[PDB]
Subunit: 86 residues, 2 copies
């Protein structure tokens, strides 16, 4: 299991916006977190939230299976890092 | 934890080869496996092995933390799926 932490300072998201190739509006909500990759300290990682989802509250989390998909070259990839409480 | 299985039919690797941009030879060893992504059946995934490593034997495995890295856009990515016995 991957240990992910939302610190008290990371309790909000920001939103970026634009227009798609064929005219549709989009909005993306992004939040920061710390992921422990086994180095001396955890590293900073950007998370893009799914539609209609609030910012994750401060606390400890792990990664949900729905974060992964098989890519176009047949290898596993992360689609979007989706988190669940630890 | 991600459940990965090497079936008895997947106990070998194949090797692809070529030459890099500035003249160096390379070889890549690839093995197939099944990863349970929570659908009705596990899906087929290609794994590229690290230098000097043998094919994983048939059995159950999970994913090692060293499989992940932060990408050039600041989001988590899989570098290479590295497996450890379950």
């Amino acid at each position: 299991m991957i240990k992910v932490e939302i610190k008290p300072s990371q309790a909000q998201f920001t939103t970026r916006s634009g227009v798609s190739r064929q005219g549709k509006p989009y909005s993306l909500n992004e939040q920061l977190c710390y992921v422990d990759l086994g180095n001396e300290y955890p590293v900073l990682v950007k998370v893009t939230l799914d539609e209609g989802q609030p910012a994750y509250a401060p606390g400890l989390y792990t990664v949900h299976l729905s974060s992964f998909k098989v890519g176009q070259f047949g290898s596993l990839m992360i689609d979007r890092l989706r988190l669940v409480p630890a």
